[PDB]
C-alpha cells in the first residue's frame, strides 16, 4: 500500500533493502504475491503493471484534491500540507470522479503534475529535469516536485511553475546549477535541482 | 458516537424533558456510556444539569452546534449542488467528510458556494459563530389552519428522505393541508392533486409554511 507509492518516486538508479528502512522507517512476499512488483537485479525492484496502476491512482486521486483545494479553496502551499493528504485518504473514488467533472478535466496540477485518466496509467507531459539539462540558454519552470520543503525553498527563492529561467551553467567542481530568473542570479544544490524539470524554448 | 453526535441529539431532543434513559436510546448505547458522556459534556461546560429541561445548553453547547450544522449543511449543498450527488450517495458519504474536514475548508467551502443561507433541504446555514436559528419552525404537526401549504423544511434523516421522495413530497412544493384527523391521528395532505396519509411521527418533521 503505502510502500509502492515510495518504490515509484526512486524509480525516476539502484533500489536497495537498506534503502526502503530509510525513507520510511522500519512487505515484500505480500507485494510480490499481490503481484504489484517483480525482483531485478538491475534495478532492485520494478513495479508490475499492476503497481503502476494502482499508484497511477493516487496521483490522480492527490493531484485532483491539489487542483480543487488551490484553485478553488484559495489554499495556500502551507494549508495543503496541513489539510490535504487526510481528506486524500478520506474521499471515494466516486468523489474525485466527479471533482474531476466539476474542474472539467484538468490536465495538470497547479505544481505541473500530470494528472491521468481513471484507469489508465501515469505519464508525466515533464520529464525534463534541471540536473539532466545541457544547453545554457533560456528555459521555463514547468514542474516541481510535490513536496512541502522543496515548495517552501523555491518559493522563498522567487521560483514558480510556469515562470521563465535563464539556465547560467552547471560547475563541474562546485556542484552548483547557475540561474537568472527576475533580473536575478541564484546558486542551486544539485538535489534542489534533481527535483526541478525545466521545457527548452 | 463522539461527543459532537450527543450534543447534536440532546440540541434538538429539546426542541423537552430529556431523560439520560431518551439518549441512550436515540444514541443506541450503552446506559454506563451515558453518565460517561454527560460528565464530559457536563465539565466541557456544553450544558448544565437542570431541574425542567434535564440539560440546558451554555452558549458554548450553543455555538458548537452552530458548527456541526454549519458543516454538515455547507458539505451536503457542495454534494449535490456542485458534485450531482444523490439522496442515496450523501448518505454514504457526507458524515465521514465532516468527521474530517478542517474548519478553513467549511470556511473557504462557504466562500466557494457564495455563501448559501440554507442547505437544499430547508435547513438554515448560520455565520460562522452566529447561533444557530432555524428559518422554518412550524411543523406540520403543530400546523393549526387547513389550506395551502408550502412545504419548507424536512430533516436529512435518510429513512425520512426516502419516504419523502417515495411520495413525491419535496422541498418547495406546494401541499394542501386537507387535516388533522381527531381519532384516526393522521394527517391529510393533497399534493399533486394527490391524497396522503402521514403519521404523527413524521408530520413532526415536515415544516411547512402557510402560502
Ligand atoms: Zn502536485
Ligand atoms: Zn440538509
Redesign the interface.
Given at each position: 500500500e503505502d510502500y509502492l507509492k515510495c518504490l515509484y518516486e526512486l524509480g525516476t538508479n539502484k533500489i536497495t533493502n537498506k534503502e526502503i528502512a530509510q525513507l520510511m522507517q522500519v512487505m515484500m512476499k505480500k507485494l510480490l504475491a499481490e503481484e504489484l512488483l517483480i525482483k531485478d537485479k538491475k534495478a532492485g525492484y520494478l513495479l508490475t503493471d499492476l503497481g503502476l496502476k494502482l499508484v497511477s491512482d493516487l496521483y490522480r486521486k492527490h493531484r485532483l484534491i491539489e487542483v480543487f483545494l488551490v484553485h478553488?479553496?484559495?489554499?495556500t502551499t502551507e494549508?495543503i500540507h496541513?489539510?490535504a493528504e487526510?481528506?486524500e485518504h478520506?474521499?471515494?473514488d466516486?468523489?474525485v470522479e466527479?471533482?474531476d467533472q466539476?474542474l472539467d478535466y484538468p490536465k495538470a496540477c497547479p505544481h505541473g503534475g500530470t494528472i491521468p485518466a481513471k484507469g489508465e496509467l501515469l505519464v508525466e507531459k515533464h520529464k525534463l529535469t534541471l540536473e539532466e539539462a545541457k544547453e545554457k540558454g533560456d528555459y521555463i519552470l514547468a514542474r516541481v516536485h510535490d513536496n512541502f520543503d522543496l515548495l517552501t525553498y523555491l518559493e522563498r527563492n522567487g521560483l514558480q511553475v510556469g515562470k521563465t529561467i535563464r539556465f547560467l551553467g552547471y560547475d563541474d567542481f562546485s556542484h552548483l546549477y547557475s540561474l537568472e530568473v527576475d533580473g536575478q542570479e541564484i546558486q542551486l544544490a544539485q538535489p534542489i535541482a534533481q527535483q526541478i524539470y525545466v521545457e527548452k524554448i
Open positions: 478553488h479553496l484559495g489554499y494549508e496541513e489539510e487526510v481528506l478520506t474521499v471515494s466516486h468523489f466527479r471533482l466539476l
